[PDB]
């Protein structure tokens, strides 16, 4: 029967069929060792001279990389085989051969060449591992919020920023965040999350944005920690093979899986960064009141062994909708979660204003057109409750978990100001 | 302890707390009957004069619609209560009152007024039911493909159609479909699906687009049937309450849940439509070679009790990438799945060309710029295998399952050429 490499362990000592591609090939003495990929994994297939028809042995001599292939054989358990299993091949059929030379030979090229060939490069071991971890995270996000009674709530992408021309003279704008709509959602369904593209490194990325009715700042941070540690735990448990293919040290991820994330106020974070900047030539000072520069963010991130929260920034550098700190008028009740190892911010969140007049005056103080926000103001006129939410950047989270050098590797086909292709 | 209405059955005869909103209110004799919503459901709460402090009874006299509320009481099982349960209230605390008159009183307004107030209207019973069914479908899609070893594969939205201005003079275009990228995905991961927004009724909608390596036309239709019948079954099993709130007859959905969907060739469909058009004044004739007009689609859809497949259309009215019918050169191996009851197309799919030169000449015959499709052509140069896929429109599927009058009701904040707000 036809099976997939991913399920090969369930078929030990049976005759099966694989359909896929020649990933690698080597020979020693009377054995050809093929590495086959079928899209769900990589598996050694042996072709043994004298134990298969000579035509089959010779045909298996004759296979360039990315030859498409059907192979038939017996599943063998064998710890000398990478994976722990191999296919003892009995028959083999070429489905197609490359028209030209395949552009990506093993262990050769630099990362940019590989990303220019992204549509082919996705087939290889490292992008395979990254994408399977990405899939694992997206599924696990839906399970995490589904099991807690959250409703997925798709925020609009077109908004009345990148500008889009509509029919006639009309113009719309690509969403940078579904949060405002998610708040309407939270007031209708108690607990919701968007899971969609937003547009601002990457021009285009994916954001999970939960909003919860009656939820406070502190509960908001607790929810963030709960989610991130669950996701790291889930990758550790189910994608340990992919982590291994990436050369990712699980020990760098285990603290995140256990929670108890350290927290810092903005003031404390600034003081810390400026202590670091004195003993360290490669970290510049940080004047109070400014947002964290890239080196500052990195220095904070590398200080801890798991994600670190930074909360209660100055109002002056945050958004109009954020709830003011009740014991400190210059600050708002917000938080950013920083991944360790220099990966930096993976979550941005806050408690939102629930008082009608406060929100009116904030909409003015921030010099905003009140009319366009009237519906948003309705959320305070009718059934207003304290509520909070946040947005998790999927690509930065993937990049961190996988240990990638750049976020563009975390998404199948990245869009950046420079590369917009394929 | 604080609980949600959705979990109320697990807490019979316990003292609990609810946090939510006054949805409706009526009184008879010494009982105030509140209908509370907390975002996860609707629940009767009784306040009994003489058994609660007089202040509490009087406070509960005093509650306009969308008053935000905390209520404490004992969960009672009671079939006279709608839901089968009610809260016997002991204490109650107003969290907030409406600033102004709430614009949506029960059983009053026309659909357009309600959609103009969509951000508030989402709180009510019918949109509640629709959105919970939508959530059920999105979760179930991830489970269906996750359990079959499909990988979620996010296709880019920005493409090199709606036009978007980038920095400098550069321009991109909102994706109308992730299929081309999904094919690269299928060749890398065997079986994939996009789950994302596309842009073309609705300007913006959600598409699940599976692609499978080595999969044929016939298997493609089998996969489509399997998926749709699973989704209908899943809504029937887990959202029967929401279906009931919608007044949706489960009997209209049960045939879809069982599969065995009828199939028609394009030629057969045309002949059928034209037979229908003779006995029926409200169905116009259909010349051979034309795509199905709206009345034709509707007449086909209303002919059957479950979704119907239409396959093997003329090449001349389909896309460049579609595999030609091997026994009939004028036709391609494609299919559209039509929902019954006049809802029409919910899936469009086909087998794709895997032969390199055939695809080159099709790219020319269709007058297309070969350069921009070179990467796509690489998918035929290297590791080319027969493959197929399709796209399921989420909103049309929701609209059909819920029995809605228009697809705009199937998405939280619809974008149409006319309404772009909120």
CB-based contact B379 A214, cutoff 8 Å: no
Q: Take residue A374 and report the two structure tokens written for it.
A: 């009237």
H or E segment at B292?
none
Cβ pair A179, A392 in contact under 8 A: no
Packing angle between helix A374-381 and helix A356-365, nearest 10 degrees? 160
CA gap A130, A139 in Å, rounded:
14
Q: Is the Cβ of A94 closer than 8 Å to some Cβ of chain B?
A: no
Q: Is the Cβ of A16 closer than 8 Å to some Cβ of chain B?
A: no
Please enumerate in sequence order all residues whose Cβ is within 8 A of that of A225, keeping only pairs 6 or more positions apart, or say none: A259, A261, A307, A309, A337
Q: Is the Cβ of A211 closer than 8 Å to some Cβ of chain B?
A: no
Q: On the CB side of B172, how many CA atoms lie within 13 Å of its CA?
A: 25
B303 Cα to chain A: minimum distance (Å): 33
Cβ pair B140, B163 in contact under 8 A: no
CB-based contact A385 B138, cutoff 8 Å: no
In A401-420, the residues whose Cβ lies within 8 Å of chain B are 411-415, 417, 420
Cβ pair B199, B176 in contact under 8 A: yes
Q: Prior bond to A20 cis, omega within 30?
A: no
H or E segment at B223?
helix B217-238
Q: After which residues is chain B broken (C to N over 2.5 A)?
A: 160, 200
Angle B238-A229-A322 (CA atoms, 0-180°, nearest 5)? 85
Can you list the alpha helix ranges (DSSP code H) found in A8-124?
Answer: 54-61, 111-116, 118-121
Cβ pair B73, B15 in contact under 8 A: yes
CB-based contact A381 B98, cutoff 8 Å: yes
CB-based contact B151 A135, cutoff 8 Å: yes
CB-nearest partner of A21 from B95, B139, B383: B383
Q: Take residue A344 and report the two structure tokens written for it.
A: 């930096």
Q: How many CB atoms are located within 10 Å of the residue B169 CB?
A: 6
CA gap B375, A215 in Å, rounded:
48
Provide Rg for chain B, Cα atoms: 26
B152 Cα to chain A: minimum distance (Å): 5
> What is the tally of helices (H) and strands (E) in chain B?
13, 18
Beta bridge pairs of residue B388: B212, B351
Phi-psi region for residue A325, left (φ > 0), alpha (ψ -120 to 50) or beta?
beta
Sign of CA dihedral A371, A372, A378, A384: negative
A119 Cα to chain B: minimum distance (Å): 6
Give the residue among A406, A203, A417, A394 at the shortest CA–CA distance from B157: A203
CA gap B187, B300 in Å, rounded:
35
How many cross-chain Cβ pairs, A to B, lie less than 8 Å apart? 245
- 3-state secondary structure at position A136: helix
CB-nearest partner of A156 from B166, B167, B413: B413
A103 Cα to chain B: minimum distance (Å): 9
Cβ pair B269, B293 in contact under 8 A: no
CB-based contact B381 A160, cutoff 8 Å: no
Extract long-range pairs of B161-166: CB within 8 Å, 24+ residues apart.
B161/B199, B162/A164, B162/A165, B162/A166, B162/B199, B162/B203, B163/A164, B163/A165, B164/A162, B164/A163, B164/A164, B164/A174, B165/A162, B165/A163, B166/A162, B166/A203, B166/A417, B166/A420
CA gap B226, A358 in Å, rounded:
53
CA gap A399, A345 in Å, rounded:
11
CA gap B128, A192 in Å, rounded:
12
CB-nearest partner of A142 from B142, B375, B413: B142
H or E segment at A42?
strand A42-48
Backbone angles phi, psi at A117, to 5 degrees: -115, 30
Cβ pair B191, B217 in contact under 8 A: no
CB-based contact A204 B158, cutoff 8 Å: yes
Label residues A32-59 b or e (16+ Cβ within 10 Å = b). Answer: bbbbbbbbbbbbbbbbebeebeeebbeb
Q: Is the Cβ of B39 closer than 8 Å to some Cβ of chain A?
A: yes
Could you tell me how far CA B198 lies from the centroid of its own chain? 14
Beta bridge pairs of residue B265: B311
Give the residue among B239, B69, B102, B104 at the shortest CA–CA distance from A213: B69
Using CA atoms, how far residue B303 sits from B298, B308, B338, B344, in Å, is 9, 9, 11, 11
Q: Is the domain defined by A1-102 classed in CATH 2.40.50.140?
A: yes
- 3-state secondary structure at position A155: coil
CA gap A333, A326 in Å, rounded:
9
Q: Is the Cβ of B149 closer than 8 Å to some Cβ of chain A?
A: yes
Q: Take residue B210 and report the two structure tokens written for it.
A: 């599976």
Give the residue among A286, A287, A269 at the shortest CA–CA distance from A277: A286
H or E segment at A321?
none
Q: For domain B103-422, give the CATH number.
A: 3.30.930.10
- 3-state secondary structure at position B8: helix
How many residues are present in chain A? Answer: 422
Looking up tokens 């709180």 gives B123
Sketch the domain layout of chain B as residue ranges: 1-102, 103-422
CA gap B328, B324 in Å, rounded:
8
Following DSSP, what letter does each residue of A350-381 receive, concatenated?
EEEP--HHHHHHHHHHTT--TGGGHHHHHHHH
Angle B239-B136-A39 (CA atoms, 0-180°, nearest 5)? 140
Backbone angles phi, psi at B49, to 5 degrees: -60, 130
Give the residue among A269, A206, A26, A280 at the shortest CA–CA distance from B157: A206
Candidates A205, A206, A377, A422: best to mutate against B (most CBs of B within 10 A) is: A422
Please tell me what resolution, in angstroms, this structure has: 2.4
Could you say which DSSP state residue B316 is in? G
CA gap B309, B296 in Å, rounded:
14
Could you say which DSSP state residue A290 is in? S
Using CA atoms, how far residue B239 sits from A18, A139, A336, B128, B352, in Å, is 39, 21, 37, 12, 36
Question: Which chain B residues have a beta carbon less than 8 Å from that of A122?
Answer: 184-185, 188-189
Question: Which chain B residues have a beta carbon less than 8 Å from that of A415?
Answer: 156-158, 172
Q: Prior bond to B68 cis, omega within 30?
A: no
Question: Which chain A residues have a beta carbon less than 8 Å from that of B154?
Answer: 134, 206, 411-412
Q: Take residue B140 and report the two structure tokens written for it.
A: 């179930």
Following DSSP, what letter does each residue of B326-367 receive, concatenated?
TTEEEEESEEEEEETTTTEEEEEEEEEP--HHHHHHHHHHTT
Packing angle between helix A179-189 and helix A374-381, nearest 10 degrees? 30
Backbone angles phi, psi at A271, to 5 degrees: -55, -40
Q: Is the Cβ of B105 closer than 8 Å to some Cβ of chain A?
A: no
CB-based contact B164 A174, cutoff 8 Å: yes
Q: Is the Cβ of A236 closer than 8 Å to some Cβ of chain B?
A: no
Identify how the structure was determined. X-ray
CB-nearest partner of B102 from A166, A197, A382: A382
Q: Is the Cβ of B377 closer than 8 Å to some Cβ of chain A?
A: no
Please enumerate in sequence order all residues whose Cβ is within 8 A of that of A111, keeping only pairs 6 or more positions apart, or say none: A405, A406, A409
CB-based contact A160 B421, cutoff 8 Å: yes
CB-based contact A160 B420, cutoff 8 Å: yes
Beta bridge pairs of residue A53: none
Could you say which DSSP state residue A314 is in? B
Give the residue among A379, A152, A170 at the shortest CA–CA distance from B422: A379
Burial class, B251, CB count within 10 angstroms (exposed 0-12 / middle 13-18 / buried 19+): exposed
Q: Prior bond to B422 cis, omega within 30?
A: yes
Angle A190-B235-B7 (CA atoms, 0-180°, nearest 5)? 40
Following DSSP, what letter does each residue of B165-189 receive, concatenated?
E-STT-EEEE-S--HHHHHHHHHHH
Q: Take residue A326 and report the two structure tokens written for it.
A: 């009740």
CA gap A139, A235 in Å, rounded:
11
Q: Take residue A355 and report the two structure tokens written for it.
A: 């008082």
Give the residue among A257, A252, A294, A286 at the shortest CA–CA distance from A269: A286
Could you say which DSSP state residue B52 is in? B
H or E segment at A127?
helix A125-147
Give the residue among A210, A225, A313 at the shortest CA–CA distance from A262: A225
CB-based contact A187 B123, cutoff 8 Å: yes
CA gap A261, A256 in Å, rounded:
8
Cβ pair A307, A346 in contact under 8 A: yes
Cβ pair A254, A167 in contact under 8 A: no
CA gap B104, B112 in Å, rounded:
12
Q: On the CB side of B128, how many CA atoms lie within 13 Å of its CA?
A: 21
Packing angle between helix B394-402 and helix B125-147, nearest 10 degrees? 120
Backbone angles phi, psi at B308, to 5 degrees: -115, 135
Looking up tokens 């926000």 gives A373
Looking up tokens 């979660």 gives A337
Cβ pair A212, A387 in contact under 8 A: yes
Q: Take residue B195 and report the two structure tokens written for it.
A: 């789950």
Backbone angles phi, psi at A300, to 5 degrees: -65, -45
CA gap B42, B22 in Å, rounded:
10
- 3-state secondary structure at position B197: strand
B81 Cα to chain A: minimum distance (Å): 22
Q: On the CB side of A177, how many CA atoms lie within 13 Å of its CA?
A: 15
Q: How many CB atoms are located within 10 Å of the residue A204 CB?
A: 22
- 3-state secondary structure at position B79: coil
CA gap A290, A314 in Å, rounded:
9
CA gap A275, A286 in Å, rounded:
10
Sheet arrangement for strand B163-165: A158-159, A171-174, A163-165, B163-165, B171-174, B158-159
């Amino acid at each position: 029967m036809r099976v997939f490499i991913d399920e090969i362990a369930r078929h030990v000592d049976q005759e099966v069929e694989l359909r896929g591609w020649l990933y690698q090939r080597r020979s020693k003495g009377k054995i050809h060792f093929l590495i086959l990929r079928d899209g769900t994994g990589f598996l050694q297939a042996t072709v043994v001279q004298g134990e298969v028809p000579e035509a089959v042995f010779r045909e298996a001599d004759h296979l360039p990389q990315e030859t498409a292939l059907r192979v038939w054989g017996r599943v063998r358990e064998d710890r000398r085989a990478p994976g722990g299993f191999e296919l003892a091949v009995r028959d083999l059929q070429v489905v197609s051969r490359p028209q030209g030379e395949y552009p990506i030979g093993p262990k050769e090229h630099g990362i940019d060449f590989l990303m220019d060939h992204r549509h082919l490069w996705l087939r290889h071991r490292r992008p395979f591992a990254v994408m399977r971890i990405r899939d694992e995270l997206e599924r696990a996000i839906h399970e995490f919020f589904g099991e807690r009674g959250f409703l997925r709530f798709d925020a609009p992408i077109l908004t009345p920023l990148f500008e889009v021309e509509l029919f006639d003279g009309e113009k719309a704008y690509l969403s940078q965040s579904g949060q405002l709509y998610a708040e309407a959602g939270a007031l209708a369904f108690a607990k919701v999350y968007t899971f969609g593209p937003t547009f601002r490194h990457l021009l285009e990325f994916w954001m999970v944005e939960p909003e919860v009715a009656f939820m406070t700042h502190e509960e908001n941070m607790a929810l963030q920690e709960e989610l991130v540690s669950f996701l790291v735990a889930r990758v550790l448990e189910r994608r340990s093979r992919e982590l291994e293919m990436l050369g990712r040290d699980p020990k760098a991820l285990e603290p995140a899986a256990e929670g108890h994330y350290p927290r810092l106020t903005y003031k404390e974070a600034v003081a810390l960064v400026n202590r670091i900047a004195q003993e360290d030539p490669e970290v510049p000072p940080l004047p109070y009141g400014e947002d964290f520069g890239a080196p500052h963010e990195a220095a904070l991130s590398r200080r801890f062994d798991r994600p670190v929260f930074v909360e209660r920034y100055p109002a002056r550098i945050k958004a109009f909708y954020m709830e003011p700190d009740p014991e400190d008028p210059e600050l708002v009740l917000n938080d950013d979660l920083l991944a360790p190892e220099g990966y930096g911010e993976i979550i941005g969140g806050s408690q939102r204003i629930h008082d009608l007049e406060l929100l009116r005056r904030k909409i003015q103080e921030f010099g905003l057109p009140e009319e366009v926000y009237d519906w948003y103001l309705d959320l305070r006129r009718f059934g207003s409750v304290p509520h909070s939410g946040f947005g998790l950047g999927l690509e930065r989270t993937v990049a961190w978990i996988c240990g990638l050098a750049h976020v563009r590797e975390a998404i199948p086909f990245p869009r950046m100001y420079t590369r917009m292709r394929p």
